[PDB]
């Protein structure tokens, strides 16, 4: 049994950041710091924390600024460092609360871009990294027109919409799409210029930032992901410095491998990979 506690901290700019702490009834084996993606929130991850908790892992999961229960204007960010600062604050909380535990940083989609960016900025500050369909090559996802728009407007007008998103691509389970579409806490609008620029910051410098990743890395990616082409992940595992790196491709899964029908196998793979590296 894994028990959820809700807490908050002051993120950068005094924005109120809400986060969950999931704690199991076994001696802590490691802490997991988890970053969700664009327009969603940490309560879309209840089942991931419960499965991690069954392996004795304590999961910390924040609602990014502008998401979920956290403060700030919805999906507003002006620089990638806003997201990574707040992620770093939560890493510190978990580090002070469970010293002597290994530290796993886990991120999906935009959260995967945030965790990669954090990781190359602080290569020595975590032990294991796990990325679900990481958004590390957004420049391959937007047109040249969208790219210049985001790069020129993302600091002055970070809420300006630049890019539509196909939400039916997040999962091939209709119930998952429907649950996303009816969630009053998720973003149903377009991709804003702010997040676009912030993700472009990550993508443009990924090939030379990545050799600074030394810690072990696991990447998960569905082959039918039409939100983030799997090719991006293949390219990332070639650029990372880490010798212990694997890409697990799941044939036929859509973008959110953790919400797909096969999610229990995906999570079984994650738990196995993590458990044997503690």
Author numbering: 2 to 279
The authors write:
One of those enzymes is the mycobacterial monoacylglycerol lipase Rv0183, also termed mtbMGL, hydrolyzing monoacylglycerol (MG) into glycerol and an unesterified fatty acid (FA). The biochemical characterization of mtbMGL showed a strong preference for monoacylglycerols (MG) and suggests it as a secreted lipase. mtbMGL belongs to the family of serine hydrolases, with an α/β-hydrolase core fold and a distinct cap domain. The active site is formed by residues Ser110, His256 and Asp226. In this work, we determined the crystal structures of a surface-entropy reduced variant K74A Rv0183/mtbMGL in its free form and in complex with a substrate mimicking inhibitor.
Without the substrate analog, mtbMGL K74A crystallized in a completely closed cap conformation. The first α-helix between the residues P145 and V157 distorts and closes the entrance to the cavity leading to the active site by a distortion of the helix and a large movement of the N-terminal part towards the adjacent loop region. At the N-terminal end of the cap domain, the loop leading to the first helix forms a single turn of a 310-helix in both structures of mtbMGL K74A. This change forces the N-terminal part of cap helix 1 toward the active site. In the closed-cap conformation, this leads to the contacts of cap helix 1 with the consecutive loop region (Gly160–Gln164). In the structure of mtbMGL K74A with a closed-cap conformation, the additional electron density in the active site cavity was explained by 2-propanol, originating from the crystallization condition. The hydroxy group is in hydrogen bonding distance to Glu257 and His109. In the closed or complexed structure of mtbMGL K74A, this hole is closed or very narrow, due to an inward orientation of L166, which would correspond to the gating residue of Ile145 in bMGL or Ile178 in human MGL. Is the closed-cap conformation promoted by the exchange of Lys74 to alanine? A permanently closed cap is highly unlikely since mtbMGL K74A is still catalytically active and crystallized in complex with the substrate analog Maglipan.
